[PDB]
Ligand binder design. Structure first.
Ligand SMILES: Nc1ncnc2c1ncn2[C@@H]1O[C@H](C[C@@H](N)CC[C@H](N)C(=O)O)[C@@H](O)[C@H]1O
Ligand SMILES: Nc1ncnc2c1ncn2[C@@H]1O[C@H](C[C@@H](N)CC[C@H](N)C(=O)O)[C@@H](O)[C@H]1O
Lengths: 350, 331
DNA sequence: CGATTCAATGAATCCCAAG
DNA sequence: GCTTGGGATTCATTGAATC
C-alpha cells in the first residue's frame, strides 16, 4: 500500500486500478489498444512484408466490445485520479473518437486535443490514402468544476512561444537505440512510444514528485520518462515479457535535472492552391521563347508532356537538371518575375 | 443537377428532399453547439449524418471538420452509421491566433474526417498522383499546413466586421476537392455558411449544392460565388494513375511483331532467362505461365511486375519489355 | 580512415478492372 | 454481386556493407 517511487504491477489494469486508493494519482497517461481492425497482410513495393500490429491484445469483436472496455477502464481511471488531476489518452482515427466520447461522457473536461505529428511515419505504400502521419492525444481535467489542474505555462516560459504553445508536436518515431529489442533481436514491443512525447506531457502537466499512473505500461516508456524527470509512477501491464523489458530499462535510467526543426517544403502545388497563380496561367522563361501552362496540381504542360516545374523545365532546355524556381517566370504588372518570388512569399508565412 | 444550387432552410429537411445516391461528395462544417447537452447534439448529429448518407452515391465519400469540442461526437456517429474512415486530417494553421491566457495549449489546428460511404465499397475517388505532384513529388500526408482565412478573402459585413465567425479558408477546400472529386462531380454542403465550398467547387469546375438556414449568410455567399472566375475545363487536368492507362496484354506484343516466339527475356542481372511462347506465355525450363507469374516464381516472390522485371536484348543492352508496351501505346 | 550504396523498418483499417 | 490475376505501389532514418 505504501508505494516507493517506482511501482510495476503485473495484471489487468481494471482490476488493479480498482485495488488502488481513490484520488491517489496526479496524472494518468493511457496508450490503450487502438483496435486497428486490419484485414490481412500488407506488402511493401519490394514485396517484403510489413510487421503489422496483429497481437491478440488489439483484437476486439466489434465497436461495442471496444466501447464497453473503454468505458470500464476510464471509469476506474477517474476513480483513482485526484480532483485537481488530469488524464492523457492517445489514439489514431481508429479509436480516438470513441475514446473522446467516453472521456466526455464520464465527466472529464477536455482542455486540449494534441496532435503528435510524426516526422518519419510508415508511408502509404499502394497509393490509396493520405499517409497516416499523426496521432491524437486528449488532455482533460477530472471535471470542468475542478479547482486548478497543473499547466506549467510560466515555468516552461511559453509566453508567445510559437512552438511550445502549439497543439501540434513534431516528434520522430521510436526507432534506433531507444527502440527496445527483444530476445529474438527484433522490436520487443510493436507500439512503443517515443520518450520525447512523454517529456512534453510530463513537463507541462506535472510537478516534480507527482504520481503518474500508466494502466497500459508496455515496455515502461511512461516510467522511464517519469523517473528521468523526477516523477513517481505506477505501471500496470498484463504481459509478463513486456514487464521484463520495462524493469531492465527503468533500472538503467539516470535521473537528470529537468531544467536542462528541419526546413519545410514549399511545393509549387501550394502556390497554385493559394491562388497566387491560377491553373491555365502561362509560365515563361527569361526571354519568353518557351511557355508552359499551369495545372491545378502544380504540374505544368508543354506540348503533350506534363510534369513538375523541374522535370519540364529540364526538358524544355534539353538539360539534365533544372531549378524550375529560377527558370520559370510569371507575368506581373512590371514584367516577368521568377516563380521563386512566390515561393519565398509562401515560405515567409510558414 | 445544375452547376450552382443554393437552398435556404434546414439541412435535415432539405437533404431528405433530394434523390438518393445523387451526390459524389459531402463536405460538412457543423456548428459546435446545437442551438447557437450531449444527448441533444448527438441526436442532431446522428440525424443529419443519416440523411447525408442516403444522398451519397455508393462510391462517394464524406468530409467533416470540427474542433475538440464536437469532433469526437461526430467521429463516433460517422463510424456507427456505417461510414468507413480512410483518414483523419490535421489542418495545421500556419498563423494561429496567440493565446495569452496561459491556461491551455494554443489551438493551432482543426481535425477533418474523410470516410467512404461503407467499408466494402472500396471504390472511391482519390487522385493520389495529382496530390503527390502537388506535394513536391512526395506523397501527401495527413498533416496539412494552410494559413487562416485572412485579408480580403475574409468576407466583411456592413460596418467592416467579420461576416461569419467560422469561415474556412478556400485553400483547404481546394485540396479537399482536388483530391476526392473529378471535374463534373457534385458536392453537397449542408452547412454552407458564406459559401466556401461553393467558391472552391466553382473554381475547380465542380457542381455544388449548398444548404444554409441563415439568409444573411446566403446573401454573402451568392455575391461571393458570382465573382469567382471559373477555370476552363481544359485546364483542370492533373497527373493520372498508371492503373488507368490502356492495358496492353503481353500477348499483343507477340502478335504485333515486336517479339517473336523463341526470343529470350532476361532479368536485370541476366541470370534468369525465359523463352517467349506464341500465345504470350513465357517458359523457364519446365515452368510456363504469364510474364508476371513466372517472374515471381523464378525469384521466389509472392508477386512481380513482368513489364519492369523482364528485359529484351537491344542495340544498347538490356531494355525492359515495358519499352515495347510504350510503343504500342504511342500509336 | 572517408565516401558511397544497400538493407531494414515503423500503431496500416493500403488494388481494381475485366468477365 | 462474385472470382481471377494483371500489374501498380514507398518516406525518413538508421546502421551495416562495400569501395
Ligand atoms: N486489460 C489490460 N490490462 C493491462 N494491460 C493491457 C490490457 N490490455 C492491453 N494491455 C497492454 O497495453 C499495452 C498497449 C501499448 N500500446 C502500450 C505501449 C506503451 N505505451 C509503451 O510505450 O511501451 C500493451 O502492451 C497491452 O499488453
Ligand atoms: N440546422 C441547420 N441547417 C442548416 N444550416 C445550419 C444549421 N445549423 C447551423 N447552420 C449553419 O451552418 C453554418 C456552420 C458553419 N461552421 C459553416 C461555415 C462554412 N464552412 C463557411 O466556410 O462559411 C453556420 O452558418 C450555421 O448557421
Amino acid at each position: 500500500m505504501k508505494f516507493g517511487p517506482e511501482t510495476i504491477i503485473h495484471g489487468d489494469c481494471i482490476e488493479q486500478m480498482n485495488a488502488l486508493p481513490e484520488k491517489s494519482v496526479d496524472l494518468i497517461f493511457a496508450d490503450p489498444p487502438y483496435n486497428l481492425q486490419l484485414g490481412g497482410d500488407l506488402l511493401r513495393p519490394d514485396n517484403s512484408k510489413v510487421d503489422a500490429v496483429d497481437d491478440h491484445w488489439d483484437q476486439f469483436e466489434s465497436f461495442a466490445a471496444y466501447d464497453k472496455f473503454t468505458r470500464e477502464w476510464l471509469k476506474a481511471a477517474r476513480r483513482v485520479l485526484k480532483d485537481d488531476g488530469a488524464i492523457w489518452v492517445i489514439g489514431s482515427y481508429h479509436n480516438i473518437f470513441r475514446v473522446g466520447v467516453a472521456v466526455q461522457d464520464l465527466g472529464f473536461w477536455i482542455l486540449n486535443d494534441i496532435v503528435w505529428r510524426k516526422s518519419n511515419p510508415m508511408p502509404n505504400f499502394k497509393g490509396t490514402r493520405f499517409a497516416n502521419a499523426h496521432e491524437t492525444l486528449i488532455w482533460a481535467s477530472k471535471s470542468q468544476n475542478a479547482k486548478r489542474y497543473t499547466f506549467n505555462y510560466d515555468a516552461l516560459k511559453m509566453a508567445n512561444d510559437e512552438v511550445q504553445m502549439r497543439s501540434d508536436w513534431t516528434i520522430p518515431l521510436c526507432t534506433g537505440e531507444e527502440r527496445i529489442k527483444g530476445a529474438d533481436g527484433q522490436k520487443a514491443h510493436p507500439t512503443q512510444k517515443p520518450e520525447a512525447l512523454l517529456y512534453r506531457v510530463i513537463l507541462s502537466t506535472t510537478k516534480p514528485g507527482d504520481v503518474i499512473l500508466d494502466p497500459f505500461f508496455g515496455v515502461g516508456t511512461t516510467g522511464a520518462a517519469a523517473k528521468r524527470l523526477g516523477r513517481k509512477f505506477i505501471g500496470i501491464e498484463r504481459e509478463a515479457e513486456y514487464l521484463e523489458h520495462a524493469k531492465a530499462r527503468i533500472a538503467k535510467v539516470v535521473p537528470i535535472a529537468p531544467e536542462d526543426r528541419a526546413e519545410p517544403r514549399v511545393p509549387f502545388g501550394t502556390i497554385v492552391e493559394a491562388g497566387l497563380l491560377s491553373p491555365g496561367d502561362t509560365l515563361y522563361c527569361s526571354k519568353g521563347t518557351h511557355v508552359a501552362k499551369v495545372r491545378p496540381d502544380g504540374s505544368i504542360t508543354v506540348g503533350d508532356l506534363s510534369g513538375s516545374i523541374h522535370k519540364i523545365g529540364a526538358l524544355v532546355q534539353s538539360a539534365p537538371a533544372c531549378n524550375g524556381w529560377t527558370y520559370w517566370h510569371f507575368k506581373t504588372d512590371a514584367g516577368l518575375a521568377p516563380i521563386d518570388v512566390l515561393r519565398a512569399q509562401v515560405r515567409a508565412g510558414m
